Symmetry: C4
């Protein structure tokens, strides 16, 4: 499939990469990355545990802080600490290394480090991975842009770049879907910084 499959077709993991306190003042669009984390949290909660898993990593939180308090994590979020840049640490693997978890929606900090390397690692596991660019950021725009462009060249192998609104509507496919009415209000919310 070139786009995400419908949420009932397979299970989807939402990978929230290192959106932590010490990055908030160093990544220009941090506020959108929080917004996207909240949007996918709301989606995940609407889809339910039959269809969605929400995975959060924190890079060295002793030094870099917890996940931003502006994110309202779902109550069943799985949160892990790491020093590896890719999110695919041994505690995460039993959550995604299952044949039913076919596709990962990935976003966070930093685009050219943890996000990039996570996408690559997921491609090595033969998973579909969709970057939500509007929820990604780096400390410099050039680092971010060049990495997005790198990931856009991997479409052939199952990694592509999309936006959170496109991702929501990819998973649903049809306004008559039973969860549409529940999800529709998320798309009426506006990014804090213009996209």
């Amino acid at each position: 499939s070139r786009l995400l499959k419908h949420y009932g077709s397979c299970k989807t993991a939402f990978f929230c990469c290192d959106i932590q306190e010490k990055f908030m003042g160093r990544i220009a669009n941090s506020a959108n990355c929080v917004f996207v984390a909240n949007r996918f949290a709301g989606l995940h909660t609407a889809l339910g545990t039959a269809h969605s898993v929400y995975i959060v990593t924190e890079q060295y939180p002793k030094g870099l802080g917890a996940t931003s308090a502006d994110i309202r994590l779902p109550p069943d979020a799985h949160v892990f600490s790491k020093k590896r840049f890719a999110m695919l640490v041994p505690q995460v693997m039993p959550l995604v290394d299952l044949p039913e978890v076919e596709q990962v929606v990935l976003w966070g900090f930093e685009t050219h480090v943890c996000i990039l390397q996570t996408a690559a690692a997921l491609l090595d596991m033969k998973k579909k991975v969709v970057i939500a660019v509007d929820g990604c950021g780096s400390q410099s725009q050039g680092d971010h842009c060049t990495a997005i462009q790198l990931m856009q060249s991997w479409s052939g192998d199952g990694c592509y770049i999309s936006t959170s609104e496109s991702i929501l509507m990819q998973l649903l496919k049809d306004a008559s879907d039973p969860v549409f009415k529940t999800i529709a209000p998320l798309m009426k919310q506006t990014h804090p910084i213009r996209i």
Copy 2:
């Protein structure tokens, strides 16, 4: 063929995606999307039913309104209502699921939802699909741009992104073509918003 074939080689479907009243004030370049709808309407009428079919969808028109009144639909336009985001609903399938209808010119609202998903669905049917970017739009520029870029990565499989003027001249191939004189005035018309 990497570009559209000449109009006599196969039949071409013009897919006008959801250019409806309630989007007109929410999609910045809506006026160009109407302009492109009118340009392809004029082309379709010049080519005739031997070579062209014009298909319009409206997403939930009870809520989102009819197709914009600024569009002058051809008298033989096939207009359908849908809730599916992709245009390939059961009423549309007998119009395009024919071996002679090899290529679809696709444009409208919104780039990252209905247009994107329609392109993907057409690629699944092994059709050639050409996006007229100058007739596409989203409520946010970021959603639109990222989706265009996604579709530009699918060239290998028969989806590429072009403009209405390029599309017209792709179908004709030569100024001595019998319909050129009829079509040429369409290209002298100017987009309402600068491209």
Copy 3:
């Protein structure tokens, strides 16, 4: 080979597409397209007929005028009239449909019509084709940009987009090449409009 081969490896055709009087005031960067035509004219003359052929087309010159008088065509330029948008008309074919003419440097007007369609036609003939983007233009920037982007997606099949200076140095490969001293002054000339 991914780039142009060295000029002695095979013969190179310079395709100067329709840089005519009536377009000069309608294509914003027309002055650069003339500049690029002159640069390649100088290169062609330095390489000699052993290694280079210079082919000019004019689209309906009765209506659109001759090739711009600001271009100093080489004395052995082959100039042809056409109504086909692609340059590969029957009079041109005996100049390029030879196994030694492996690669074509292509530029001119308009990017999304004659240039685009010529590239496609050359790809059908299994030739390498390199677009000199700095010598290409359209009446609208959007038409031009979208077509360049389309052609950049065809790299896999032997069409890529480069610039005239890059093209010169691709053909030569080494400053100790016998023609370098002759060609070097062309690269010191400055585009009339900043690139």
Copy 4:
């Protein structure tokens, strides 16, 4: 592997292309290209000769000057003169034409000439090559941009475009890596010109 392998997996060559005195005042972002040369010099010295080789070329230094004095070359840098545009001259080949030297980090002047042609030559040798775009430049922005875009289309074959910070963290993979503490200060240094 789609990204650079970890530094212990194979040996990495840092190719510093022609960052010479006479270009410094002619390439707008020359100061960043020096900065990137220094960053990779520091990385190379931290990794050691087991894992890294630093190769510098100078194009006709009699005419174009030495490598910029603002670059602090490592004491074991291998520096060579050339007239070939590609860096893969006979003196360089015994440094990289070894099965252990699997990947080259490439940057310098000019993007559309020596850098471009070096990437192509390395691809011919079946090496992985990663362009550090933030350390590349040309005398004109258009020449540089178009060449970067050309190289971004070669990802399928083992050439991609990244940034120096992304490259550093690709080679390391994990903050608990023994050299991280040594390398981390390099990433806290700021480019002289905003990226």
